[PDB]
Design a protein around this ligand. Structure first.
Ligand SMILES: Nc1ncnc2c1ncn2[C@@H]1O[C@H](COP(=O)(O)OP(=O)(O)O)[C@@H](O)[C@H]1O
Ligand SMILES: Nc1ncnc2c1ncn2[C@@H]1O[C@H](COP(=O)(O)OP(=O)(O)O)[C@@H](O)[C@H]1O
Ligand SMILES: [Mg+2]
Ligand SMILES: [Mg+2]
Lengths: 372, 173, 372
């Protein structure tokens, strides 16, 4: 086989490309657009739908509809059309003669996996693929073979403790709070200052604001005390229309929701406390590397000042007699892809695909008994 | 003890270090030039002659083809020691996994037969030797699996695995 | 001169080495532990079983299980694996090049010894081997000729009284209470303190706790009474996780079971009383010599303060006229191996081997014919 495609099916973005390298050959938001206007002027082929960067650019007169909600696909038609876009208009390769690599969050419904693999078989006529949890891909990106991995994507945040060469399925825990919920909370709290953001285009604008302005509080009460005399923390940003805004404590109050999920009315421990609980749920001995290897992946885990806050929280919760260090590579966006490409390029993996020949009689149910 | 590879008499055969680049038939990927489909290749003759070579205790080498035969015998002994008490699909899985493992090569510290096998001359020679040995042992394991289950499916034949404990030359991979 | 392997496959450790060495050069726990997790991770050549120090180090995700139960072999395949490890990966000597010297507890089942010699001859193709007794080798290592040897290892506790040369076979008393039972009792009595240890890894942890935080009180009732003013009795222990343990009367209560076997529900006399009973079982003349020669042995007898208590109890039991002397060499941990190495390098011993040809012509009953 010449090459092997790897398609990181992210909840908010899409990562794709060939094996071996690391640079993403195709990155674009996972969005399908539907126009919501008459369009009196007629000509040059007014298409019925827009995807990717084209939809992102033309969002002015479009309704942006995400196809994945909390790591679960719910718009299968839009999803297969996005996959068509990825394999034709972005990678410019024929899917009929290349193995694929798909990424799925842990604890996802089995129906999602079966229908994904059956669609990839039938609609695309692909030789084989694999469905691996993105935690092991993050671990490959880190290069090590041991340590709990905190993954915080756009829809779902999950932790997977993996000791040397073995994983603990009973200790795997996930949370339904992620970047999309953070964006929604930021959009809600911006209204306190009078700003209005309701349409999905305004949601994208708020997402960009969170992208390039927000940061994690090292000490929540201390920074509230500092913001009482709000003179330096205030920043500014320009909207696409042209009018300028100013964001004060809302800059760091919205990513604080990760550590206090009660802000958005969810009863659940923060990311730090969930990581601590997942580690303590593990066996009494394997906790060494689990304290000493906290691999953070995902786009949401790249706020300017999240690593130190997480380290402080875990140090405070855990016993003081042993060290806790946080691993956070600068290439944190694409660690899942890097791990996927490394796994695909491994020689030992060449016989662990789910080939079409075996599917010809096994059926879509083979995915659970082959990938797990 | 006079049994030796029939391809030691080959002329103009390419070589790496002091190991001959003998032709091989396989469905795998590697540098070995495909051989005739109606002949008696190195792997088949090595498998056929292992059951008699593993009982001798004195071998005199005549050329690089003998080195290839010795390497094949060592791999056959290892596989017979590993394939014991398994299924068919599990057997191919385990043997492919062990064959693809990053093993020791002549010129390295871990090679037990470093005295007789010369180190590669160049890094390109080292890499071509790497791929040659990988392809050779992959095809050897495939042929051994094909031969040993010639009668049933769910269990290895005890006649062919009774040689597992036999420790050929007391030196092996 | 005629170096021979000396393998003392004790119930808790496998002490091995060549004949004539001052101390054994191969000591490691007798544990074979398979992984108990799915292990979705691929690569790194994850083995299917780990033996010895590797198993102890990886015990975080391993199902450790001893292949021997109270001196009796119950996991013959696991014991063959352990023997292969000892011969190759730890001593690095071919079995067919040196003879071996084994030990087994008195009154053991005959099939155990028969299968032991059968395996060591048929499988490893060793030239010759001998099956001695732990008490005899302890007498060798003590540099004496008479006296009753109290041996208490991980598996079983036994006394073999030996006069000048001659050993009385009708006065051998064997008691199954041993270090493993003491460890189990320690696990049970740590629950009442609060800390819970369940799995095999926690069993090794509590064994490590007893390794260095336990002793035998000279007096029991007074010690328990003064434990009420808990000042100089308890002292903390650092658990592998990081939280600290604090054990009080548990320090000396769990070794008390040796002298009071009723704690674990056994209608048997303690070691202090069974020694006196074994002495009284002998003849009326040799008892005076046996009183003044008490050879302590085994790893269990390394409790700081056991010799004093044993001497006091035996003095109380025995008539007050003659003196009771107890022998506690500082190196009595490896006394059996020392005696085995001493015995192996003796000129008269080469005639007492079991040559390979003799076994081949005699069957597996030659060990009963010759060894004992
Ligand atoms: N530097 C950054 N600052 C703030 N937020 C970021 C940054 N980089 C990425 N994000 C957020 O991370 C999200 C992308 O996560 P992604 O890697 O797509 O997860 P998944 O692949 O699981 O969908 C985006 O919604 C974005 O808001
Ligand atoms: N210093 C010590 N203090 C307390 N217990 C010990 C000490 N050393 C060894 N032990 C106990 O002795 C046991 C080992 O006995 P061992 O000498 O291996 O007997 P055998 O060789 O017959 O198995 C271990 O289970 C351990 O709990
Ligand atoms: Mg993701
Ligand atoms: Mg012992």
């Amino acid at each position: 086989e010449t090459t092997a495609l790897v398609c990181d099916n992210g909840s908010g973005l899409v990562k794709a490309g060939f094996a071996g390298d690391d640079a993403p050959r195709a990155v674009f938001p996972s969005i399908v657009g539907r126009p919501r206007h008459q369009g009196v002027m007629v000509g040059m082929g007014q298409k019925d739908s827009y995807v990717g960067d084209e939809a992102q650019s033309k969002r002015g007169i479009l309704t942006l509809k995400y196809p994945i909600e909390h790591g679960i696909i719910t718009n299968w038609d839009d999803m297969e059309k996005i996959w068509h876009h990825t394999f034709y208009n972005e990678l410019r390769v024929a899917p009929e003669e290349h193995p694929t690599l798909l990424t799925e969050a842990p604890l996802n419904p089995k129906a999602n996996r079966e229908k994904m693999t059956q669609i990839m078989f039938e609609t695309f006529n692909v030789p084989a693929m694999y469905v691996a949890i993105q935690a092991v891909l993050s671990l490959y990106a880190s290069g090590r073979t041991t340590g709990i991995v905190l993954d915080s994507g756009d829809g779902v945040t999950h932790n997977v403790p993996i000791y040397e060469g073995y994983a603990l399925p009973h200790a795997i825990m996930r949370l339904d709070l992620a970047g999309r919920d953070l964006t929604d909370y930021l959009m809600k709290i911006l209204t306190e200052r009078g700003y209005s953001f309701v349409t999905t285009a305004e949601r994208e604008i708020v997402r960009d604001i969170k992208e390039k302005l927000c940061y994690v509080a090292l000490d929540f009460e201390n920074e509230m005390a500092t913001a009482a005399s709000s003179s330096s923390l205030e920043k500014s940003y320009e909207l696409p229309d042209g009018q300028v805004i100013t964001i004060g404590n809302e800059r760091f109050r919205c990513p604080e929701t990760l550590f206090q999920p009660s802000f958005i009315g969810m009863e659940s421990a923060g990311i730090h406390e969930t990581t601590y609980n997942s580690i303590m749920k593990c066996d009494i001995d394997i906790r060494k590397d689990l304290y000493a290897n906290n691999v953070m992946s995902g786009g949401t885990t790249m706020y300017p000042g999240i690593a130190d806050r997480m380290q402080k929280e875990i140090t405070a919760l855990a016993p003081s007699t042993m060290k806790i260090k946080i691993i956070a590579p600068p290439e944190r966006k694409y660690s899942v892809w890097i791990g996927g490409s490394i796994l695909a390029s491994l020689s030992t993996f060449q016989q662990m695909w789910i080939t079409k020949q075996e599917y010809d009689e096994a059926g879509p149910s083979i995915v659970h008994r082959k990938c797990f | 003890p006079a049994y030796h590879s029939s391809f030691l008499s080959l002329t103009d055969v390419p070589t790496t270090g002091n190991i001959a680049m003998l032709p091989l038939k396989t469905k795998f990927r590697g540098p070995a030039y495909p051989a005739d489909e109606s002949q008696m290749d190195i792997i088949d003759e090595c498998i056929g002659l292992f059951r008699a070579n593993c009982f001798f205790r004195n071998f005199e080498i005549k050329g690089p083809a003998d080195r290839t035969l010795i390497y094949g015998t060592l791999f056959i002994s290892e596989c017979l020691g590993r394939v014991n008490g398994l299924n068919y699909r599990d057997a191919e899985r385990q043997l492919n996994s062990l064959a693809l493992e990053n093993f020791s090569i002549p010129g390295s510290a871990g090679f037990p037969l470093n005295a007789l096998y010369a180190p590669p001359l160049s890094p390109q020679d080292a890499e071509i030797m790497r791929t040659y040995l990988t392809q050779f042992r992959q095809e050897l394991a495939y042929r051994l699996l094909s031969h040993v289950y010639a009668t049933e499916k769910d269990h290895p034949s005890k006649w062919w695995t009774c040689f597992s404990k036999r420790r050929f030359m007391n030196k092996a991979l």
